[PDB]
Design a protein around this ligand. Structure first.
Ligand SMILES: *[C@@H]1O[C@H](CO[C@@H]2O[C@@H](C)[C@@H](O)[C@@H](O)[C@@H]2O)[C@@H](O[C@@H]2O[C@H](CO)[C@@H](O[C@@H]3O[C@H](CO)[C@@H](O)[C@H](O)[C@@H]3O)[C@H](O)[C@H]2NC(C)=O)[C@H](O)[C@H]1NC(C)=O
Ligand SMILES: *[C@@H]1O[C@H](CO)[C@@H](O)[C@H](O)[C@H]1NC(C)=O
Ligand SMILES: *[C@@H]1O[C@H](CO)[C@@H](O)[C@H](O)[C@H]1NC(C)=O
Ligand SMILES: *[C@@H]1O[C@H](CO)[C@@H](O)[C@H](O)[C@H]1NC(C)=O
Ligand SMILES: *[C@@H]1O[C@H](CO)[C@@H](O)[C@H](O)[C@H]1NC(C)=O
Ligand SMILES: *[C@@H]1O[C@H](CO)[C@@H](O)[C@H](O)[C@H]1NC(C)=O
Lengths: 311, 146, 207
């Protein structure tokens, strides 16, 4: 008695969807003037979106659709074509899912691996759908101009203990463009994630510095801490050194040098004879990169600095 | 068992089933008097007064719910069985015999309807059952005849 | 056995495996169901259906009935089944309605009445069961060790009570639990504690 077209719709969040309906009763067609639409058999769609095409067919268009809650076994939504008296049992299914899944990864200090991950456990709008990554390496830099980007090829990676699907790459180019996205397929159709790119050179996290040493200067009273420059990468960078009074819990404090040339700094301490712990952290001067993992703890030996003033 | 205990137990069971129905995520606000062209075999709409029609509509509701394999429908059917038994006990206490109603011959038309659509059947059946049980609670106070 | 607040299942255990001495005997549980409440007269049902079920680390054989008939009578007994014969434990009657323990009351809020200097506590009735219930009030001064002085409420439509306290400024803490009025049932668990906020109850009496 009611024919719907299109019967099934699968779009993304914020899309713009249209539907049509034809209603007949007692072998007669109700004119499109009296046609109203019901959503989920709970709330009535306002007449503002109602438009008339002819004397027999009336269409409706939804604006800025939201997500669909998982309601028991059923995972879809129902839209009805109704006369002001009755409503037929035939409904048109409307599926919608989110495509905003973040991506981010760091060029390891070895400059040989580039591993990152994509999680979907938090997302509930998808179920029983295969997921696969796509990427592309042709440009030297990204963000030059938006492009349609038709060319693509598949890849493969596996699930870990956590739901965050990590994937490992093989030798990469430090200066190249890598635009990647996820894809969606479903029984009704297919979708894809919004594009984005990451520059391997600007996302390098340096390895923690080694051979860190600290010792209070003699007849000076200035705590001098010595370190070593991380081998990779070669760009100019800034040092953050974090230190405090050694113990089970340490009242840490923060001081940060903006010059890469300097390799040791002196600073007076409040307690002249006490165990002290220092730590070293590294980051890019320009701000493009990741903070390094914390160095090994470093200590010193308590021993007399100057002559006692009072006997 | 005293008759008053059964009388209050009927109301408690009706209220419990109504509260359970009011928990499903589909039928929060779908109205109990909605008219659907195809779904006409589901009992409801017009009120009922006699116990014969009472057992009849309860049996039709039980059988239409039996077709649904959902987790939260099995418990409703289980409670409906006890409700029907309590109704039979009350009818016996009213000194009138009520026969165990058999399968309604119109429920076999549900085969096409269920395959064609399930969401409409779910919503309409749950809403009509809730409305019929509210009518149950309202009517049982007057203590009508068999 | 005990029924959860959601009134969806019945769980119980038997306590003879560890306490009793005679081990080396296969044991099982048999249940029989009647449409109405189980008769007050005593009898053993010849027909039974086995209900195999597991064991807990504590030594108590916990096992559950996923679908439950709310108003139907249940007869259960334990069958010790030796090599030279078999024996049946004494039976019992368990009714799911007269057993359910309600969920704790929700949204407990406590405040001090202004210009009156008393303590008012409000509560919300739990969704289940649908029968009339009774409540119990606990309160005391906040601290590492709290003193509890209790009050009983024997009304169904009363959603708030007002009661006196000796000191005003000190922060209090209240907890509520529910229980069926008639007596057949189990006490609920204490709700999440509620805390009050010091406020200017009244004008100072003297300068
Ligand atoms: C879905 O379709 C809309 C078409 O317009 C839509 O229908 C109209 C009857 C109104 O109800 C609109 O509110 C409604 O969005 C696509 O375009 C959108 O059109 C509106 C037209 O009003 C745009 O609003 C304009 O924006 C300027 C600048 O902000 C405002 O000052 C004015 O109020 C002016 O009306 C709106 O920006 C425009 N885009 C969006 C996202 O709403 C809409 O793009 C489309 N959605 C898709 C394709 O995802
Ligand atoms: C989507 O959800 C937001 C959140 O309340 C609401 O404001 C908006 O009206 C919803 N849009 C539709 C089309 O339901
Ligand atoms: C899954 O995606 C592949 C392409 O990657 C497609 O060939 C297949 O049909 C999809 N599965 C569906 C739509 O069920
Ligand atoms: C720094 O820590 C992270 C996480 O704890 C670890 O994956 C990495 O190997 C560490 N780097 C070192 C120890 O140089
Ligand atoms: C009891 O043990 C005997 C062993 O001969 C067995 O035949 C019988 O089935 C058992 N009954 C039970 C386990 O209920
Ligand atoms: C109350 O706590 C006990 C812990 O012994 C638990 O078994 C019981 O289920 C709790 N009550 C409710 C209603 O959950």
């Amino acid at each position: 008695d009611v024919i719907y077209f299109p019967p099934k719709i699968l779009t993304s969040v914020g899309s713009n969807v249209s539907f049509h309906c034809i209603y007949k009763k007692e072998n007669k067609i109700v004119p499109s003037k009296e046609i109203v639409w019901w959503m989920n058999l709970a709330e009535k769609i306002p007449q503002s979106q109602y438009d008339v095409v002819s004397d027999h067919v009336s269409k409706v268009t939804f604006f800025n659709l939201n997500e669909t809650k998982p309601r028991g076994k059923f995972t879809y939504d129902a839209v009805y074509c109704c006369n002001e008296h009755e409503c037929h049992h035939r409904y048109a299914e409307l599926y919608v899912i989110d495509v905003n899944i973040n991506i981010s990864c760091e060029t390891d200090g070895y400059l040989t691996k580039m591993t990152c991950r994509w999680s979907t456990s938090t997302i509930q709008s998808l179920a029983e759908s295969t997921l696969q990554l796509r990427y592309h390496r042709s440009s030297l830099y990204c963000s030059d101009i938006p492009s349609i980007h038709p060319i693509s090829e598949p890849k493969d990676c596996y699930l870990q203990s956590d739901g965050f699907y990590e994937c490992i790459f093989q030798p990469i180019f430090l200066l190249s463009g890598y635009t990647m996205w996820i894809r969606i397929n479903h029984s009704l159709g297919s979708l894809d994630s919004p594009p984005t790119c990451v520059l391997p050179d600007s996302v390098v996290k340096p390895l923690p510095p080694s051979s860190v040493k600290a010792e209070i200067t003699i007849n000076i009273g200035l705590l001098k801490i010595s370190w070593e420059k991380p081998v990779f990468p070669e760009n100019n960078l800034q040092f953050q050194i974090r230190y405090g009074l050694s113990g089970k819990e340490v009242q840490w404090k923060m001081y940060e040098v903006y010059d890469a040339k300097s390799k040791s700094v002196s600073l007076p301490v409040p307690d002249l004879c006490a165990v002290y712990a220092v730590q070293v952290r590294c980051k890019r001067l320009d701000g493009l990169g990741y903070w390094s993992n914390w160095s090994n703890p470093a200590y010193t030996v308590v021993m007399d600095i100057k002559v006692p003033m009072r006997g | 068992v005293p008759i008053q205990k059964v009388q209050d137990d009927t109301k408690t069971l009706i209220k419990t089933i109504v509260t359970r129905i009011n928990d499903i995520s589909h039928t929060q606000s779908v109205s109990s008097k909605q008219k659907v062209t195809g779904l006409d075999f589901i009992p409801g709409l017009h009120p009922i007064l006699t116990l014969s029609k009472m057992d009849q509509t309860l049996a039709v509701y039980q059988q239409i719910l039996t077709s649904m394999p959902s987790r939260n429908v099995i418990q409703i059917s289980n409670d409906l069985e006890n409700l029907r038994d309590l109704l039979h006990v009350l009818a016996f206490s009213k000194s009138c015999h009520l026969p165990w109603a058999s399968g309604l011959e119109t429920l076999d038309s549900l085969g096409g309807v269920l395959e064609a659509s399930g969401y409409s059947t779910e919503v309409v059946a749950l809403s009509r059952l809730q409305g019929s049980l509210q009518d149950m609670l309202w009517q049982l106070d007057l203590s009508p005849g068999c």
